[PDB]
Design a protein around this nucleic acid. Sequence first.
RNA 1: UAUCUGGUUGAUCCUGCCAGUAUUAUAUGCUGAUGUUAAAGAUUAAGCCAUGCAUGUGUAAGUAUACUGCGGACGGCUCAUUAUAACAGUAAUAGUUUCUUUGGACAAGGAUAGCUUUGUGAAUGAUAAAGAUAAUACUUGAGACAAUUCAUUCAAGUGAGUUAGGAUGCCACGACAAUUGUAGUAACCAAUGAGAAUUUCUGAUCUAUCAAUCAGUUGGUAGUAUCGAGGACUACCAAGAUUAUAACGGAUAACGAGGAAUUGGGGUUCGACAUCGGAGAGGGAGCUUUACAGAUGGCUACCACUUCUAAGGAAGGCAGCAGGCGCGUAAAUUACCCACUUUCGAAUUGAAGAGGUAGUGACGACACAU
RNA 2: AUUACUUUGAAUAAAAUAAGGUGUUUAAAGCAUGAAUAUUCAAGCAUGGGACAAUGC
Lengths: 82, 106, 133, 129, 256, 141
Amino acid sequence: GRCLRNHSITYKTPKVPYERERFDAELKLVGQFGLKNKKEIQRVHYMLGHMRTIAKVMLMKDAKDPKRLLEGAALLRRLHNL
Amino acid sequence: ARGLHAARKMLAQRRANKWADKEWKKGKLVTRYKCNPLGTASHAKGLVQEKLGIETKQPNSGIRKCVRVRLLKNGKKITAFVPRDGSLNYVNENDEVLISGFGRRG
Amino acid sequence: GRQGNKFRVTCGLNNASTVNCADNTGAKTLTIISVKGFHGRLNRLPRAGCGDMVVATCKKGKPEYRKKMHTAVIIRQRRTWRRKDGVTLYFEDNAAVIVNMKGEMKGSAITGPVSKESADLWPKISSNAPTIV
Amino acid sequence: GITRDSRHKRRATGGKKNSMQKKKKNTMGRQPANTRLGAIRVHDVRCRYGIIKRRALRLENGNFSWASQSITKGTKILNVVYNASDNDFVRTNTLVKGAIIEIDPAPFRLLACISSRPGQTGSVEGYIL
Amino acid sequence: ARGPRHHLKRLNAPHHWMLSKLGGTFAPKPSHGPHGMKECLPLILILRNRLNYALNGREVTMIVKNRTIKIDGKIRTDTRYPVGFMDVLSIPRTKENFRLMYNTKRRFCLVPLTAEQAKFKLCKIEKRVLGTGAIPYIVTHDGRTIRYPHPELQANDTIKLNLETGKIVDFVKFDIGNTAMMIGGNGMGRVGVIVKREVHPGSFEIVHIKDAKGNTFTTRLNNVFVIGKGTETLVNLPLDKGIKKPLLQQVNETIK
Amino acid sequence: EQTERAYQKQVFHHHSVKRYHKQIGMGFVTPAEAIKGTYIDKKCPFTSDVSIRGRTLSGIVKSCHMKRTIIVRRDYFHYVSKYQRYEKRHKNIAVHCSPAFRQLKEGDHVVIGQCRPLSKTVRFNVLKFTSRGTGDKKQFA
RNA sequence: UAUCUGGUUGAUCCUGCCAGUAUUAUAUGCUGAUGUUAAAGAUUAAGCCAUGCAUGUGUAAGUAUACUGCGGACGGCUCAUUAUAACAGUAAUAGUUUCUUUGGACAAGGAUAGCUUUGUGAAUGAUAAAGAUAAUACUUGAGACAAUUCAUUCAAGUGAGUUAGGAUGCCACGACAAUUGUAGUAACCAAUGAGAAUUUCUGAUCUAUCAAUCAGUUGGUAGUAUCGAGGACUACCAAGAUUAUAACGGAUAACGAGGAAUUGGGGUUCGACAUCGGAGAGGGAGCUUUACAGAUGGCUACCACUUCUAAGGAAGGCAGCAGGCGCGUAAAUUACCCACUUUCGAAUUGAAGAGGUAGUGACGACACAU
RNA sequence: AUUACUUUGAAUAAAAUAAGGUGUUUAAAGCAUGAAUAUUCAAGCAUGGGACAAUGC
């Protein structure tokens, strides 16, 4: 550690670098949204996985779990107004 | 050695059985700092002594231009591959040449 | 490199006479080989007094000084010698400091006293001496 | 000086300790002041935290006690007779706690064991068997 | 370290001091005084964080040095005076007074004090010691040494002190029929009624306290500060009364 | 009883000299042999002024060859996180054995308690002992 | 994203490894429009240093036609040492403890400064002596106990005390400035003090081409020493302590913890460096002042270095901030200011290369021209 | 009768890990009400149960 100010990353490169089943679909979103490069596609993919895991961890417990009710209600509430 | 209270045999077995790999063992023997001409360095600076040409292996043919370089930190002799076509002319005698590994690890 | 006229000092060091090394050059003992300015005679061994430049080989010390011939100056000797003002004095042991022909001392310090006869002869030695007896 | 730390000793298994740091001042130690016989001479040493210890080298008068009659009158001590800590302490006539001494019962009538720390308290006290 | 430590780094400060992490490298070190290092709030932070009177800490010196702030029965002139428990705090130059109090959300809250109720302050008996000369006296929570107290007092009771006269007014015993407010860790900021105390001869004494609404919480004996005897409140409790809301009306309420 | 060079005298001595025995604390009983005994000890928890603090362990007495001091053995366990399995271990502690317990022998369960440093390695006192079996080695203190 | 692919053969099915792959942290080639944030002499050398700065302080309340008081024992830098040592969680001090802060004779005796008076050296924060001159510098003085030491007693809350306290006999220091404005002192009790220091339990990499190890060593008695317990040391006594559950020894390119990189679960690698604790100021060693230093921007001696010189001598420790040489694959300006945070002070003001701004900066992070 | 096991609590540095809230224009940021913020692996303290377990009368 070197600096007190926190930092984070947003996009992670896909593992397989060259696929024709992923190159074609990238321009079906780049051309449609008028995106500049492929950075944005990775960034939303981080976003979906940001909450997809959160939904999966708290889905394994009972419906009466106090943490499931606490964070779950906030998780659904945050994702409804968005 | 599956028993619940036998957590010493299993740990001791793994400590013993881990020394037989050819890759991690290189990371604990003191030979990188001793026998490796590079050591733990990315690049090695040296001095040119001799120009040599190594013929290729059996299936191939031709002479690969190379130079025998003596380092400045260890003094050992290592053969270096001149990079490009006709690039043996660019190198001279008694000049600083950077030496940095190859594709295969170490 | 000497500056002055040495008086008469009864020489007590012969050929192959081990002396210590008051210097700090990583040499311990220097066995005398010759003496500079020695007017020799038949069957006579070279004699070194106090303040006499010698030529000595180092038989004990650091590797870059061992097994080589150096030039030293005797700073104290165990042989009683009489000053001109009627003083009869002698030291505790022999010693000598490594110098060069110009007199420039090779070391930077001297351990123990230095005889007066060897201090005014070489002004580069008197400065380093703790005391000058 | 004399350090009372445990970094120069060995372990319980006989292994030798390995050094990490130099001596620390919080491990002070002063040479013993064997309180011998003689004229009154007590020094003052400055201990840690500014407190002062009455360091005694030689004293001849000690304030004694004897509980069977509850009288405490000081008297001069003749010489040390027997010591339970060391035998060579008898001849040197040093004053240490738990040392049998002989006295003159001049103010006790008109064998003493010391029960003070003359090297630290600066004074000699005792009682009668 | 060779001796005492003077500079307190920002992060090493107790978390209930409302301090940031990027503001600066150091935090004001509370001096020796009536309360502990981590049990206090330095007077410099009170007048710059809770009160917002000064833009920076330089102007705090231009306030305390003027003999402006009065604490307890005296008036101080120390910038970083250690302000801990519910000792009164009066600033006549602004006609307003406060009181340093804990809250259920693990912080230091300031409840305003009127001029009529700033004349006295509560103190907690820490130990009863038979001093020399057969003179018993009791050490209070604020470190106050007092003269001959009531002989009926124990070492774990509470004494109603007055500032000007400096005499004991009323005493409330430590028994099963009283009420207390906590100063501990998780339990601090919680008020309730003691219901049961279990004594362990080994290390500690553990006491069970029930909240007003029926909530029951457990804490150590060292955390107990009795506020009254028989569910009666002898001082102005904070805005939240010191109840522990079960987090149902915090996540949902803050939405609107 | 009185066999050494110095006059072995008890720290708290009072003329009727009376035997000073103070009652112990956390639910232990004072041994009967310690009241009518003629022994003397300057570090005994009962007849002297050494207090037993919060720490208290137990084990099996291993050696009884040391004067007024014994060695206890504690065969505890350690959980290795990776392997989910426990590996047996041991630790030997020297505890000061008061001469109140005369039937204490090797292989007897003993309750120990902390106190001030009595020596370089000894920092505990014996509080009670329980008898066990025998192995032809009836070695007492 | 719980993922594979090319390579032994004419061809097939396996073990098997090489290479490919993605990511973090170092260096480098090529290119490089912006805004915000930000690493940056550690790896090899805890190697050597020219220079400049980094610890000083005056309110009406000490002395006025510099002395005295406090601080430099904090801050800051580096990671050499270090393998149950340190460190982390925890427990004890009924085995010790300060500094600062908060609660309890209408006036004595003196000479040492400032300024000179005559100077000596090439200099060293160089030093001589002659005249006075004040104290909140030093003694006294008195206006009146407290607290320690020793032998003996009355004996309670306390988990637990011949204990806090009281009473004896007795020794010792012995007070409440001879104190200032037109606050200041002596002690004694308690808190700050979950602090500082010791100490209880548990926990550490590889190695058996380390299998037996220890003689102050294991414990007891009695003393000494230290603020304080104890072989910490001393004199006597007995032979005891660890050991296959890895003792003793060896290596580290080993400061430890909080944590970091990467993970389906499990795990592996790293951590000098934000914060806490530890150690060190070229190398040990010995001490001064003081409440705390074994202080090194304090002293001394030795080993190795550096600087001026009138050749008689003098001081210095950049592993502080910039900067210089070497080392290397490898790393920034010989800048300005106490404005933000904080610390020190004779205390609202004075100081801080702590701290902030500026400068280089493709280590990295976010939005983004063409 | 201890210990282990298991359920609970107490106390448990901050920074940080995942975040509760909060349009630095979004975001990286920051805490401008301070999420109960959960954190403590290894140990230790008190506690409900004794099926599986180790200790010998």
